[model samples]
Structures are given as C-alpha cells and as structure tokens.
Target chain A: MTVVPVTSADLDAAEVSWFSALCSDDYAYLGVPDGSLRSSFEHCSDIVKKAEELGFRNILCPSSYQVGQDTLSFVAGCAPISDRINFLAAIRCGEMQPIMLARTVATLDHMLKGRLTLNVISSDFPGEVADSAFRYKRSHEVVEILRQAWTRDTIDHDGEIYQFKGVSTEPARPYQLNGGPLLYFGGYSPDALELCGAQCDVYLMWPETKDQLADRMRAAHERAAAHGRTLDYGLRVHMVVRDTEQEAREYADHLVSKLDDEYGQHQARARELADKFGYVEPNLWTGIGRARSGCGAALVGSTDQVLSALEEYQKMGIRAFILSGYPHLDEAEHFGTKVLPQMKTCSLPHAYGRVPSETPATPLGNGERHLE
Target chain B: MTVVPVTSADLDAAEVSWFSALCSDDYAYLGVPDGSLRSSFEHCSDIVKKAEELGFRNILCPSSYQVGQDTLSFVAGCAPISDRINFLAAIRCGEMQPIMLARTVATLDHMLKGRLTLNVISSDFPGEVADSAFRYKRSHEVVEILRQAWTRDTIDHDGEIYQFKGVSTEPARPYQLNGGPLLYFGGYSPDALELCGAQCDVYLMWPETKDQLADRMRAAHERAAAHGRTLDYGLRVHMVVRDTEQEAREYADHLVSKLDDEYGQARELADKFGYVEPNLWTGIGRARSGCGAALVGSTDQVLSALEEYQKMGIRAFILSGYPHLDEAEHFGTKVLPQMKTCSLPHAYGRVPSETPATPLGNGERH
Candidate 1:
C-alpha cells in the first residue's frame, strides 16, 4: 500500500472533517432536540464558517427528508461567502432527473472551483422505500452520468435506470480536472459495497470495532482491486474530547444522562449492549447509538487518547474522519482546540490528487463592482 | 379606477427593483460579452449586497436556458446574508417537478421571512420548444400548484401538466400568509396575457410607447375586469442617467459606441419612440436581449418618465443597465431616494410568520 503525503506535510495527514446538522440533528442533550439549533441558514452557515476558522479542512452539509432546508440550496448560499473550507455536500440520488442533477452539480463545482465534494446518498426518497438493488442501480446511473458530465463535452449513457442519447455537456463541465469531484459513499450491503468499490473514490463505514472495521476495509479494498481501482477509507463517528480521559468519560455520560440511564449500569450494556452500545473498545463508547439510527458512536477520551485512537484507525486504513457531537457548533470548538492541532490534516480530494490548486473561479482582489 | 396604497404612505410607493445578471448578462460595453462580468456567484452576490446597501427595495435574480446558476439556488445562497432587502427570483416553469419547486419556494420564503417574491417564467425548455397553449397550461398548473401548497394544509391538484392526489403540505407551507409570494409575471402572447390577468399578481411587459403601453394595460385590465379583479402593471426596461440631457444622451450613445453605431443616423429614427418628452431611446434593443428600450436622460428626465408611467398606472419597475453592479449604485444614489419603495409581498398583505414559532427568534423583525 502506498502512503499518501498530501501537500500539507510529509507526515501522514488524515482528512479531519466536521458535520453540519442540516436536519435539526443538533441537540443540547443526546436524544433531545433543540430548536435553537434548528438548521436555519444563519445557524448552520455559522457552524460551517466556524469549522473553517478553527482549521478543520472540510464540513459535511448533511441532508434528510425532513424539516430542514434543501441541501443544494443551502450549499449554494454558503458557497459564495465561504473562502477556504471545502463543502462535502450530501446529494440524494434519483431525487431529480439525472441530467438536470448533473448540470446543477457542475454549476456548484464551478462556483467553488475545486473546493466542492459530494457525498453520494442512496437512501430512500420521502414517503417511499425501495429495494436496495433498485436504489443502488439508480445510484450507479447517477454517478456514471456525473462522471460523464465532468470529463466529456458530450454525454451518451445507456443504463438500467437512466438512458439518454448524445447530450451536450457544455457549461456543465466541472472546474476540477482529474476525474471530477471525489465521491465519498457510505453503505454496508452487498450492492452498496459493490457500487462503492467499483465506482466511488472513498468508502466510508460507520463506527466499528478495530477487528470488524479492518475486515470491512479489507473486503472493500479487495472489491476495488478486483475492478483495478484503489479506494480510500473513511470513518464517520461522534466525538467528545477533553483535558483528561476521566473528564471525557464523564462528559460522554452526561451527554446521554437525560435519557434516564442509571450511571452504574450504563457502563454495563447501557441496555445489555455493552459490546454493541456500550464501550466496544477502550475510550470508544457505542452508547450514542441510542440517539441517531445511523452513525451513533463516539471517541470518548482525552485529546492525546483521541489522537492515538485516530492514529490507530489510520493504520487500520481510515484516510478520512467525519466527526461531530451534540450542539454541533459547541462541540466543534472543543474538538477544534484540543485534537485538531495535534494531528496532521488534509482534504481528501487534495490528498487523492483530484482537485487542483487554481481554477478559473478563483476570486481576485476584493470582488468589488465599483473599482472596475 | 381605485389606486392601491401598497403600504408606504397613501402617496403611492412603487417596488423599485434592480436586476442581477445570473446569465453572464453583465457587460461593461453593450453588444460585447466580457468574461470579467460572467455571473460567478462572487460578482453577482456582490451586486445583490450592493443594491441592498444602496437602498433598492428589491433585486431580480434572473434565469435563462443557457449559462447561469440555478435561480432558486442562487437566491438560496443570497438569502442568509441579506438583511432587509427582498429577492425577486425568476423561475422557469416545468424545468423541474412543480411540486418540488413549490417545496423549495416555501423553504426560501421561510428563510427570508416575507421578503421572497417570485417572477413566474413560462419559457421553452432547453433544446425544445412547444406550442403556447401547452406552455400556458403548464404555467397555470405550476402557479396553481404553488398557490395550493402555500395556502392549504393539503395539496390536491389535477391538471393536464401535473396530477397528484392528497399530499400533506407540511413543512412546505410558505411563510407568507395570504397567498404566499406574489408572482410577478412577464409575457406578451395572447395566452400569456390571459394567464397573467387571471392567475398572476403583477403583469410585467417590456418597454413600449405611452399609448402602446397604455393600450396593453387597458386590454389587460378589461381581461382582469372580466374576473372582477384589478391588476397592477410593471415595466421591465433599462436606464442611463447623467447630469445633463446632452451628457446623458452622449453617454447612452457611447455605451453602444463599441458596436460601431452611426451616432448621427442613430438619431434620425429615434424620435419615432417619443413619449411626452422623447427620453425612451429604443437603440438599446439592438445590443440587449432582454428589455427593448432605455430611459436615457438626465436624472430629472428619467425620473419624469418613470413618474409619468406611474400616473399612467405602472406600479412596479424592473430596471437594469449595461453592467449591473455599477448602474445599481448609480441609479440608487440618483433616483431611489426620491422614490418611495416597498416590498411587493408586504404591500399585498402576504407577509408570513417568522421563526421561533418557539419564541426565541420571534423578537427579531420580520
């Protein structure tokens, strides 16, 4: 395996990213919702700006079929004001016509130059559920179409879910040159694994035990190698870092205290799930699984322990880490200070050689209307 | 005829608006395309903020079938940063699912809190063109569908272009109370005129003579009269204002000089478009694709022309210049302060409830 030395430094740098709670997923207490952080553009955009200010390289603009704003529009508004931070905008497949979706993706890509990245979401649409096979097929079609849009002047695609003949890709060309924006995909089923391994740039898996995660990454790597492609690995998990390990554990316990768990037994199963929902490993608690249906675990430890834990994951092959905590902005500050500066961080797209430094969309000098 | 108050003093405040060239329509010189003015979000977003700072009540975010950012997306990006100004976003009908478009419109409306208005566009899709009847039906259906989503708890619509059974309008309800965002529509086909008179809130037309414009409005007025309703009129035109009449006309000529126009011959036929004072120069139509004329004159002359149109029953004016950002401030410093401006949605009594329906954000102004 070749270790990547991205532009930031020669030392192994992981892509440390933050998450924006676009679906009102932000909470003051675990399993409790807060209206103050209700995913308004003001609140969420501030979180993104804060993450960028605190030296995190990228932030995830999450999507859901709920009360929050539309993902693309939210990012569109955020892009003009954003200077350096890269946006990992979540896009739902098969939500709109694939051709139009391709056009929009390119438009945003050009606006951000090489700063735009996409998270491929294959979830079910609102009020509708479908077989994973069908969802994956549509996802595959969307991905292939987007690639064609970025790489070619004309797009001709014949697929199971979408078929179009001889469409001009003019004006839809992305600013990023090498293979378009990097696609980070997350899923675990056979179909999803096959799709990610064959087509996606990064294969992201939820929190898992070291052994379990190692096996999953190896399976994904083998799947990619069979297709003659190499894939990067990513971990999406929650985080809580403090001065000391005991303080970190106490904070993590209090995060879920509103859920009415007995402090003594909580350390044991928390629900007979000590192995699954409790601490699956040292300093890595699985109890946050009580709140979010997906991605419900955190690294509860001191800053050094958190750093060591991430270093260990890097050896197990995690090139990117998407981390968040309750009341996203507040947690971002904690992580930003303690753990952020301890480790080397790089943008995944930059590390993978997909994004170039300069593009046509680069803003020059104050962006004023009067001086000219 | 009953004159509308429209919320500024009973003295008739118009919605004086500016236009943002999302389609790379900005030109330092007319008839010439400049890449520097290409509608990158940075350049366009700056224009939006500048116009708000310059005191223009609203600005139009234009859309085209060609090179441009998505209209709603552009407005979505602009809404969070904008404080007091409203956005009049142009949306192409049938470009996407109408139902989905309604949901997006409502989302933006909530973000802006009664400051979002829409300009309804019924244009042919890229690489395709259809008959006007089919197009109008689709436009009407979209407008009706958006109205249904905003005003009611459930959406049930059956039309030629779209049909959906009972679907909950939850979370999609517009922040505007009465009829959601006011739809400012522009078209000239017979079907277009009929659609606007019956289904739209504002009837916008490109520049024409005083008699010609009045006749169009009267015909439109009678069409609305048939439905027992009155309609407000808007003129979508360009402007060039300077200190003196001679300087204004000279600058207007120079704006198109790069295209090698014969200045002397340009005036030989300029009089045919004369209004009361002959300030409306139709020469700009040759170099522009949007509006057909420019109110080129000294500040007083251009302001006089607009005031005359207001008396002639034009309530709203959408104006632009060769390059948008420069002229946005130029006109703002000159004419906007003298004009009483109000947001069209608020004037129409459709401003909606703001946030903190949980009390936290409610203390802020709407």
Candidate 2:
C-alpha cells in the first residue's frame, strides 16, 4: 500500500474543528458550576465567534436530546453572525420530515453561503425506541432522501418510515462543496459503518491509539472501497496543552480534581459509554472520563507532544480533528496559540471544492502560517 | 355597547410591524424587476435591521412554503443578531408535531429573550387539503398544545386532530408578558373568528373602511365577551406614504404601471383574491396576494386613516408595502415618528381584570 505523503499543505493547514457544546454540558471542571452564560446562547455564540477570530477553519455545533439548546436553531441563529467559519450542524434523524429538513438545510446553507456541513446523528428521536440496526436504517433513509432532495427537482422516497410523492423542495438546493456539505458520521456498529461507508463524506471517530486509529481507518477505507466510494477522516477529542509536559499533565489532573466521587458515581451510566470506547495512553489522560461521557480522553502534553500526535494521526489519513477543552473559550486560545501556530491549516470544504478559499490569515510564531 | 377611548398611550406609540417578504414577493413594481438583493437574505435582514434601527417595536417575519425562506429558520437565525426587534414568527400549523413545535418556539423565545410573538397560521399544510373549519380546528389544537406546554409541565391533549400523552416540553416555558408572547390571529371565517376570540391574545383583521373596521372590532369584542374573554385588535394592511397625497397615489399607480397585460391576466386568478373584502379604494395596485391592498395616501392621510382605526380599538397594526426595502424606511420615518407605539402587554395592563379562566368545553357567558 502506497503511503499518502502528508504534504506541507496537508500538515501546514490541516482542517481544525472546534466543538461548541450547545447542550449546556460545558464545564471548567467536571461537575463544576455550569453557569447561565456558559449554557446560554450568548455563551455558545461567543465561543464560535472567538474560534473564528482565532482563525479556526470549521466549528462543530453539536446536538443532543438530553441537554442544552436545539442544534438546528442554534446553527441558524449563529449563521448570519458567523463569517469564515463552517458550521458542522448536527441533525437528529427522525426528528423532522426529510423534505422539511432538506428545505431547512438549503435555506441555512444559502444564509451561510454554502459554509455548511452536516453531522448526521442516528440517535433515536425522543420518546421513540429502536435497536441499533433499526436506528441506522432510519438514518440511511434520511441520508438517501436528503441526497435526492438536494440534487433532483422532485423527490420520491418510499422508505419504511417516510413516504413522499413528487416532493419539490425548491429554493433548497444546497451550495455543494466537494460533493455537497460533507456528511460527517460516527458510529461503532456494523450497521453504522455500513450506512456511513455507502453514503457519508467524513468518517468521524473518537480518540484512539495511532495503531488503533489506523486499523479503524483501514477498515472504513475497505468498506468504502467495497461500495466504490472514498471518505475523509475526522477525530473528536479533548485537549490540554501547556508550555511544559508537567504543567499539561498537572492541568489535566486538576481538571477532574474537583470532580466529586458522588457526582462521578451518579454519572456512572454515562461513564460506561466512555469506557466502552475509551482509548488510554501516555500523554493522553482518561481521568476526564470519570466525570463526563463521550470524547472523554484529553491530549495532555507539551505543545510539541500534542503536535506530534496530531501529525501521526494525519499520516494515518485523519484529515480533520474536532477538538474541545474543559473551558472551551480558554483552551481554544491555548491550542490555537501554541500548537496551531506550528501547523499550517486548510479548509476541508475548500480542499474538497465545496466552498471558495477564504482569505488566509497569518499563522502563529512562525512567519510561515498565521496563528490565532 | 360603550366605545373605548384611544388614549395617549394608545396613539402616543403603537405596536408597529414591519414585514420581511421572505416569500420572494417583494417588488418595487408589480411584476417588475425584483433586484437579486431584494429577495435575498441580506435584503430581508436589512429591512428588519433597519426597522429595529429606526425604533420600530416589532416586525412580522412572514412564512410561506412556496417561494421564500422558511419563517422559523429565518427568525431563529436573525434572533441573536437582532437586539430590540421582536420577531412575530409565522407558525404554519400541521407542519411539525405539536410537541416539537412547542420546543422550537420555546428555544427561539429564550434566544430572543422572549421577543418572539407568534402569528398562528391555519392555512393548509403543503400536499394536503382540508376545509377552513378543519384547518382552524387543527390550528386550535396546535394553540391549545402550545399553551399547555408553555404553562404546564406535561401536556395532555386529545383534540379532534392531535392526541398526546403527558408530553413534557420543559425549558420551553415562554417569557410571559400579559400571559405569554401574544398570539396574533387573522381570518374571515367564523370558525377562525371563534378560535381567536376564545383563545388568542390579539384578533388581527385585514384592511377595512373605518365603519367596517369599527363593526369588525365590535363583533370580535362581542365574540370574546360571549366567551367571557377580552382580546386586543390588530390590522394587517399595506401603505404608501409621500409628501403629498397626489404623489403617494401617483407612486402607487406607477408601481402597477410597468405590469405587462399578460402578467396581469395571469394574476387575474389572484386578482379575485384581491377583490375579496377589498380594503383600499382608487386601485392601490394589487399584484401580491400577501397583503393585497395598499393604503394609498399622503403621510397625513395615512396617519388619519390609522388614527381613525385606532379610535375603533385596533391596538396593533401590521403594515407591509410593495417594495419593503424602500417602503419600510419611508413608513418608519414618515408615519412611525408621528404615531405613538403601544405594545400588547402594556395595553393588556390597561384593560379590565375580567380575564377569563380556561374554558370548560363550551361555557356560556354570565
């Protein structure tokens, strides 16, 4: 197998994804005070605004039925104010009609000037229960319907759940980039992989060891090739970068230091989710997992160590990285200032010809690429 | 029946509504060139931004499935950016599950800091057909569900259209001002009138002569009174204001002048809609089905006509024009400066304490 050389353009300007926990799950410390400002619209908008100000290319506006704001509404409200940042809007399948969803996406895409990407979620709609296979099948139908609506004049879908006849979602043709806003999907089940391999644009995975990441990517690559398609790769993880390795590790420990055991026990059910897919290693702490669920591991190291790990992932064909920190506003400034400077950044949408190349800002310390 | 006085608070400042023709119907001339900017997001946003900038209290963000942007999405996107302007979001009933609809409204209300007022639309949902009574019944169920979700924790409704079991739409409790974000409803049908009089905060009416408006408001007042409920009144109409009455009339004429006979003939079907309960005289150039008739007059004449309607107990006025970009400014600066705007909450405070309890099926008035 020929190794795809990570070029200066690839390494210089890799696609950086900033995470906005719109569901009010944000915290400075696990089980700490989540304030009005932090969970509020102004707070989330401030984070995304700061990320863009700091020269981050794309920001992930996450979705959840459990906590925080509605993902689609938050994205729509933030679209006008956000310039030069692509919003990876999370769509909960089965929540809305596919035709209406298509129209909503197309309308928002127009507002964002095609600076829109989708994070297709197969989560069961609230008050509905389905097995993993059934859920993925519903998600697959949603994807199929959306594709038809975006490209064709009249949409015809005869799925198990939704049936439409000559539905014309006009005024909703999206600004296609790469092939349309890339559908970034993440799931571990076979049905999930099968659905993604056939339709999705980016295969997003949680943190894993370099070897494990390569294995996962290779498996996904084969699945896509089996379906005669290709996919970009993305990683969702947490970060804590400092000047010294000791400081980084200490900060990572201090993050969960105040995490009360009682609170952690209460969050055990959530912790199980993290544990099921947890990837622990040197320079990456899973202590955060004790307090939170989902992408619980953090990159805790000196700037160079974090950069090296990122480079390793890139060499494994992970083209994008959606990262977050305990205090989202502050850590974005840290990684954006420290590690982001040494690296060159490019837009995934622009790279894939989905959006026009935005005016480049200077990278950090180096005269080469501008840093935030 | 005793007539209600139009106070300084009523005429000193009124609830002024500006329109965002997200329906791709905004035009300088009927059937004329609509600049790409006019129908675009930037243009619609500019109108609302300017309306807020001009100190207009509220603006109507209209909804249509046919031509323009989705109302809720456009409003949600505009909410964070707009500071003072209230978005009267048009909720087309039967589009989404009532539970989800309630959630969407609540989320947007929080984002807007309770600046979201609802314009409940009972129009037929796309690809489905239902009679007016059935449509309003569906609309009534939607309104009932929203009220329940906003005020109570778990919603229970087994209406003619929707049935739900203990559906809780928490965190969607709207910022209540004089009993929640005011519901503005408009319709000509009796069932529509009955729904508004029974439940809505404001009873909206299309353009009518001063006598017609007075009679209309009196009838709505009686309907509400029969149900032991009192409601505010609003008017949705078009306007063209100029320095002189002749110029205003001339501008209105010029608006329809560039229209091709062929286009006018094609629009004759719509012209029939224009003829139904027509509001303005001297032909105010009816091409747009959305707010068909324009109040063609000079600034003084328009203000006098508005003042007369106010005297008839119309507290809120939702005004649109042919070309919103230009007319919004013209009306805002020209008429708004002269009119004293009063909001529904403030007006509701001035009314009697005879607020009716939640209805028991069909209770007779005392």
Candidate 3:
C-alpha cells in the first residue's frame, strides 16, 4: 500500500495549502495558531465550518510552553463554532491536578456530549521548565508521573521530591476508554518516543524528510512492538497540493522565494526562539516559524505527487495526518478540492486493527488501486 | 401593623386551608417525606411541579443527621422540576469539611445561578449524631469549627481534634453571591441562642404555647442582647385552619385526639435519645414536642394566640402541618393565606451593627 513521504520544505507549504483547501470542512486536528497578528475566531470558524462541510472528524487545541492564552480557553472558543466537532485538548501532565482536570474534562465532555480527547504533553525546554514550581530534572521523569497519574488506580509517591498518597482522579466507574481520555503524544527525542510508545494511543512526529521519516517510524514501531501494542502514527506538517506535479513544484519554489526580507527574517528569528525552546529541526526554518511557533514545515506538490510521497509514509503505518498551510483558507481550498480527492482512494491496511473504511474498494479502502 | 398569632393546635389544618385557598401560586418547601426513600430525578421534578402549581414558593431540603440519601443528590433532584423556585437547603456544619462544603456550594450556586440558600443547622437529635464520623462530643464545638470554615478567608486549624493549615474557600472573582448565601439558624437552648445570635441570620424554634414561647423568646433575646445583637425568630409547628373559628377548633381537637398512640409512645424514646443531644428538647410525651405536637386550635384563635408569644420574640418560621401531604395542603390553605395578609413582616431590616428595627413589628422585625 502507498504511504506518504514528506520533506521539510514540502511539509511547510502542504500544511498551509491543504488546510486552505479544506477550510469548509472538519479535519482531524486544527490548532490555535500563534503570531503577533493572527487570524480571528471568525476566520477560524469559517475554516472549521468549511471543514465540517467537507467532512473531517476532529479539531485539536495546541498547548504552548508560555503562549499568551491558556489551552482550555482556546478549546472552549471552538465550542461555539461547531456542534459536531470533537476537541483534542493539549495539556501538560504536571501543570494541573488530575482530579481537577478530570472534573474540568467531565464538564467539557458534558457540554460536547463526550467528544473530549486529551493530548498529553511532556515538556523538554529548560527555560520553560523553570517557570513551574514542580521541578522535573529530566523530561522522562515528568512523563512517568503523568502516565501513572492518568492510568494508575491509586498513586503513592515515595520519592524525596514530590510526595503524595492515594492520588486518584475521580469516582467515576471504569470508562469505555479504560481509565479515561484518549492519549496522544508528539515528540522526536528518545525519551519522548519511549513514553509515547508505552502509553500513547497515537504517536505524532514533527515534520521530516522521506528517509528520516521512514527511520523514525521504524524506531517508533519497534518501541511499540516492544510494549506489546500497535500504535497509530501521525505526522504534523503543511501540505500544498495542486492539479499537477509541475504546478506543485513551482508553488513550492515560489513560497520559498516569494516572501519579502522582513518576513524571512521574522521566520528565522521565530525558528531561533523555537530552537531555544527545543522545538526546532533541520529544514524547519523560522519563516513559517515566525507565523506559527510549531509545525514549521510545508509540502508543495501536485495531488498525485503529494499522494505518491504521502503513500510511502502511510505504508509505514502512519494513519493520522495533521496538515496545515499559510494564507490558510486559500491554500486549504486548493488542497482539499484537488489533492484530498485524488488521494482519497488510497489507504494501507493495519496488521490487526480496523481499516479507515470497511468497504474493500472505497478511496480509502485497502483494496483501492492507488493503495496497491 | 398587624401581627397574627397561631394557636399551636389549630396551626396545621388552618394553615393548610389558608395556603390552598390564597397561596396556590406559592411554592412551599417539602422535606423528602421519607428520609430513607431514595428519590429519583423524575420523582423530585414531580414534587417540585406539584408544589409550584399548588402555590409553593420553594422546596426546603432539611438535613437531619444525614440519615438517608446524600443531601446534594436530594437538592439536585429538585433542579428538574423548578428553575424559578429556590431550594433552601438546611445544612449541618459538622457533617462536612466547611471548605469542601463551600466549594461544593459554590459549584451548585453557579450551576443553579443564585437559586441556592442555606439553613445552617447547629442543633440536631442525638440518635442522628451517633451516625456521623465527626466527633461532636459537644454541639458548641462543632459550630465553632463550622463558622470559621465558612466566613474566614484563611483558616489555620491546630485544634484538639482536627488539624490543618491555611484552608480557603476562595470563591469566584465576583464572590459566589453578592454576600454569599443567606445563613439561617435557630434554637432556644443557651448554646443554640449564642450561636444563632453570633453567627446565624435567621433563628428558628419549635412549637410552644403562647406563655411558654414568650418565656423562651425573652431568654433568647436576653442572650442575644448580651452579644449586643438581636435575631429574627422562627416558630416550627403543625397547624389546623378552617373557614370558621368553630370548624378550625373542631379539626384541631380531632387531630389532638387522633394523635397516634404508638407515635406518642415513641416520643418518650425520642426524649431518652435526646439526653445525649442537649441542643434539642425532645419532651412533651403524649403531646406535641419540638414543633409538631402543638395545641389544636382555630385560625383566628391560633393567630391571636401565637401573637402574644411572637411579641416576646419569634418571627420567621417553618412548620410541618403533619401527616405529610394532608397537613401541608391544609396549612398552605388555611393559615398561611390569612397570616400573610394578617401578620406583620418579620425579616430584620437593619444591619447587625446598626440599631435594630424599632417597634417590634413582627418577632423578626424586632
């Protein structure tokens, strides 16, 4: 089956244009974007309404190391925009009490009729770590506390640093989702990958090129295999898809050379800041970085070309795609109309899990010709 | 200003008729008729709607020893039936950690939106006391803890029994209510009087003959006066009111004679149980005790009769007309309608530090 492979440059443009194309319908995840001057709720709502019109499943709220607004409020803002949309709220394990967080999530779930999913966050930036009262000397140690707190029936801490006993979340009976909440984690570091593999249902990666992408998936899959679990992989990137491969390549080159010096410098400075926060990688520069702090790459190509590349990664067992692009609405329109439809017929079957479609011959079916 | 006294005997039937006749639009407070009976949301909604149609102002949820289903559940059940009607939850201080209680109440208050009021209960029966884990060897001590928990911004408790440091019920930015919930309490015992005078907004009492009530009121007043404070008094009783004085008297006498022999005998047992609990006076064996066993009398007679006693101090009150449904309807019909028109107002108008309302208009307006 065909899967997608992404380059740092390709992912950047794809992120914006794909999202711009699908601005009329719901996608799996949409972030609360960051910048000095950014889009308003009205602008985002239009995009979300279009996505729902197009038929995507969920919207994601991004967490920040020290972004201006809190995560919950950003998610709550989405509530008024769409009724059928589900929310995946990103939160740090150490930032809040699990019980209180459970109460909050319960209330939100009630409002949304049980459409609340959680994105468990583990921080790596030392500068951001200093802002918190709870000291986590290592990133892995923080993830350990979070996993135990979320899944353990009762937590008894015997350590010298943090001490507490019988810390349980809520008095709720066992949920259909086991201990409760959908666990999704994103990271590239070994420590982050280990934690995600052990407990996370979905493991997400920052944008990377084709060869690097395959290597990361193999390692993540191996780790998941060690834990006796089959994990779903997600890629956070930008996709710009068009009617033809020639048009896509031209668009990619144009985005790289189009923006003025000021925008370029802004992007570079943003990348520097992200690197200080340990959120940067090669080919992921500060131009898009200046506009949005995370997910700093783009993919620009024709529908078939982008699909061909994505098909390669999809074969690596990447089932979820978190794609976005700049000048968001316009790019999403271009990608959703031209690219998404062409790639719709291709999907890879999982070893033992359910396929995206039950039909054997739908666009996303395992038996689809494009997938073969 | 007119003040109508209610004879203890005639209170139930008389008030029931008065309420049924005039206060049909009011929503009356009804205790969960059976403490042991677990009420569902549908059942409570039915109760609320029925009460509202019958002219009840609100349904009161009284906490007695935490004997049955949880109080929060009971109150929550009332939510479905009436959004406009308020729930005056009579809560006990000892049964909960005040900060937790505050937080819970704050949450409820936000959910209900200014529809919550609390009746602070410092006095309860001993039989009920045995069930709670909070060791209230003395009721006074419990009140001390409860008050500190509610009003204090920060509490550092290093007391004999329980110890904690810096507990807070930090409410929302605007504070949950304009001044928090209306705090209500009442009792005739010295300890009860002191606590009420010092802390409670409304002071409540049970049934007493006019003379006996006067004496009790005078004493509570003296206690409050010592604290340089005055309290709004409430009388709890069963009533019998009818159209005419003669009919009211006959119904009251009938009820008096019909008092269950077994129930009267149970009074002695209640008294024996009352020994461990001093705040409650569980006397009046074979007769009306606490508030229920009041003397049988007519509407006018009950009014004239209760007036003399109320003048001594009692004002705002709650009464159980008796036998649950029948007496509740009777008091609502007969006594309440006439009394609302006849009795002068009872709520104290002035602030605690200011001069109390002049000319003891009603026991509360004192």
TM-score of chain A considered alone, across all candidate predictions: 0.90, 0.87, 0.65
Listed in order, the DockQ scores are 0.29, 0.27, 0.04
Candidate 1 — which residues are off by over 4 angstroms? A1-11, A94-103, A110-113, A127-135, A157-170, A260-276, A359-372, B1-11, B94-100, B127-136, B154-170, B190-195, B219-229, B258-277, B352-366
Candidate 2 chain B least-lDDT 10 residues: B357-366
Q: Tens-digit lDDT track for model 3 on B1-366?
A: 112222221222211111111111111222212221122222333444555555544455554321122334345434433445555676655444343344445434433444555667654332232332333333445445445544565546565654546654232111122234545566655556666666555555666445565666566666766777655555665555555656754554454454444444323353341211211223222342334444345556656645544454454445444343455566556555554421111112111222221111011210
Cα TM-score of candidate 1: 0.86
Which one is best on TM-score?
Answer: 1
Q: Model 2: per-residue lDDT, tens digit, A1-372? A: 212222122443478889887765678777675543345576788889989988888889877543346778888888888878988999877666566677777777777876789899897655445787777888888889888866676778887876777766554556563345778887777887887789868889887776777677777767778888777788898999988998987887677778775434455454454454233776777667777568867888999999998887776677789999978999999999898878777777767776544421111001121010
After superposition of all CA atoms, the RMSD between model 1 and the true structure is 5.1
Give one digit per residue, the lDDT tens place, for model 1 in B1-366.
323321223437788888877876788777665767867767888988998999878888887644556678778878877898889888777775676677678668776876888888887765346887898888888888888887776778877767767766654666776767888886677788888878768888789878788778777776777777777788888888877889877877777778644443523554443233389888776564677688888788888888888877688898898778887777888888888677777778788444534111332111
Q: For model 1, how does the per-residue alpha-carbon lDDT over A255-349 read when each residue is reduced to its tens digit?
A: 88786544334454444555456898887798877664477779899889898999898866677899898779988999999999888888777
- Highest DockQ: give the candidate number: 1
Q: Is model 3 an incorrect, acceptable, medium or high docking prediction?
A: incorrect
Q: Determine the C-alpha RMSD for candidate 2 after optimal superposition of all C-alphas.
A: 8.3
- Compute the interface RMSD for each candidate structure: 7.3, 13.7, 21.0
Give the CA lDDT, 0 to 100, for residue A255 in model 3.
50
TM-score of each: 0.86, 0.85, 0.44
Which residue runs of candidate 3 sit more than 4 Å off their true CA positions? A1-49, A65-84, A103-114, A124-170, A174-181, A239-287, A290-292, A302-309, A326-338, A341-372, B1-268, B271-366
Ranking by DockQ: 1, 2, 3
- How many angstroms is residue B310 displaced in model 3 relative to the true structure, after the best TM-score fit? 19
